[PDB]
Design a protein around this ligand. Structure first.
Ligand code: A1A4E
Ligand code: CL
Ligand code: CL
Ligand code: CL
Ligand code: CL
Length: 308
């Protein structure tokens, strides 16, 4: 039962632009619900259409639940000059930016944990019949360095009870993250999300390299058909790279399931230095909420698509 809570414009203070791009415009603000002195840091999204963003709200409200650690939750919507979505501010931004900016303190334990968490979030969505269709490092957000959530439901589709696939029309889509069958046939499944997951893992393990850098999107299907894939990141031992390679198998049903990826990456996270080789790993640290001074980090922080 999908509900949308309408939040009054007057309940938001200190609204400031955070960034714009393919996803629209995102602002940060403080939400003060009437009848509370609680001030909640929020992110606020609008497109650049009203209908498009309501489709995203619908999907997000549909998949929310009491226990939902790794998928962004819609707090509500605001009707202003635009229709806006409201969510909890993720103060450390997106994981693509995070891994580029904190490379020198990202250890093996963080990378593997992020892999587990994304897989848990995707398994959660699969259980709710949701095909995300846009999983990428740019669309994973960082609540704390130890805790990430999947975002951007702009392309996501709910499968009917009898449906195993979504067939798309001619909209703009992220070719370099897509399964071969999605490029050729516009077919999307849970197993095509698994392909995108493998690309997402590659982005993390390269500390935010661009996939197939300097290769035109029009050439990707031919590269994949020839058996070529993204290269082995230097930190990755063979077992980690083989997971990625299994995610990029031609046969969709041969690819790992999210349930299996949770288990495998959890196993690796139990012995992280066995699976990723990072110079100075043991000497690295990132802010954690168990730190006395974590609040410092928070204040400091809080303060792709082509036509097929
Ligand atoms: C990713 C960086 C990035 O997203 N940044 C850099 C500074 C601002 C910005 C845009 C942000 C943010 C942010 C912060 N907190 C929560 C969410 C988001 C957000 N960012 C993106 C999406 C986000 N999700 C939002 C935002 C508001 C409201 C809702 Cl309901 C919601 O969930 C859908 C998103 O939807 N798509 C991607 C960006 C690297 N660049 C993306 C390249
Ligand atoms: Cl974890
Ligand atoms: Cl979107
Ligand atoms: Cl194959
Ligand atoms: Cl692309």
């Amino acid at each position: 039962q999908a509900l949308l809570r309408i939040l009054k414009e007057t309940e938001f203070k200190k609204i400031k632009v955070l960034g714009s791009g393919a996803f629209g415009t995102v602002y940060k603000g403080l939400w003060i619900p009437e009848g509370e002195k609680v001030k909640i840091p929020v992110a606020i999204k609008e497109l650049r259409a009203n209908k498009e963003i309501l489709d995203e709200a619908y999907v997000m409200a549909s998949v929310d639940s009491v226990d939902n650690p790794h998928v962004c939750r819609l707090l509500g919507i605001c009707l202003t000059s635009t229709v806006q979505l409201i969510t909890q501010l993720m103060p450390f931004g997106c994981l693509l930016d995070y891994v580029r900016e904190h490379k020198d303190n990202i250890g093996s334990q963080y990378l593997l944990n992020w892999c587990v968490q994304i897989a848990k979030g995707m398994n959660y969505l699969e259980d709710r019949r949701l095909v995300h269709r846009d999983l990428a490092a740019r669309n994973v957000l960082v609540k704390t360095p130890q805790h990430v959530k999947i975002t951007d439901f702009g392309l996501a589709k709910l499968l009917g009870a009898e449906e195993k696939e979504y067939h798309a029309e001619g909209g703009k889509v992220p070719i370099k993250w897509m399964a071969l069958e999605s490029i050729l046939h516009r077919i999307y499944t849970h197993q095509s999300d698994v392909w995108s997951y493998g690309v997402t893992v590659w982005e993390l393990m390269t500390f935010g390299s661009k996939p197939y850098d300097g290769i035109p999107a029009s050439e990707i299907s031919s590269i994949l058909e020839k058996g070529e894939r993204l290269p082995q990141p230097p930190i990755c031992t063979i077992d980690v790279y083989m997971i990625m390679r299994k995610c990029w198998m031609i046969d969709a049903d041969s690819r790992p399931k999210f349930r299996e990826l949770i288990i495998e990456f959890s196993k690796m996270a139990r012995d992280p230095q066995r699976y990723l080789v990072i110079q100075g790993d043991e000497r690295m640290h990132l802010p954690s909420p168990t730190d006395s001074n974590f609040y410092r980090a928070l204040m400091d922080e809080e303060d792709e698509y082509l036509i097929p």
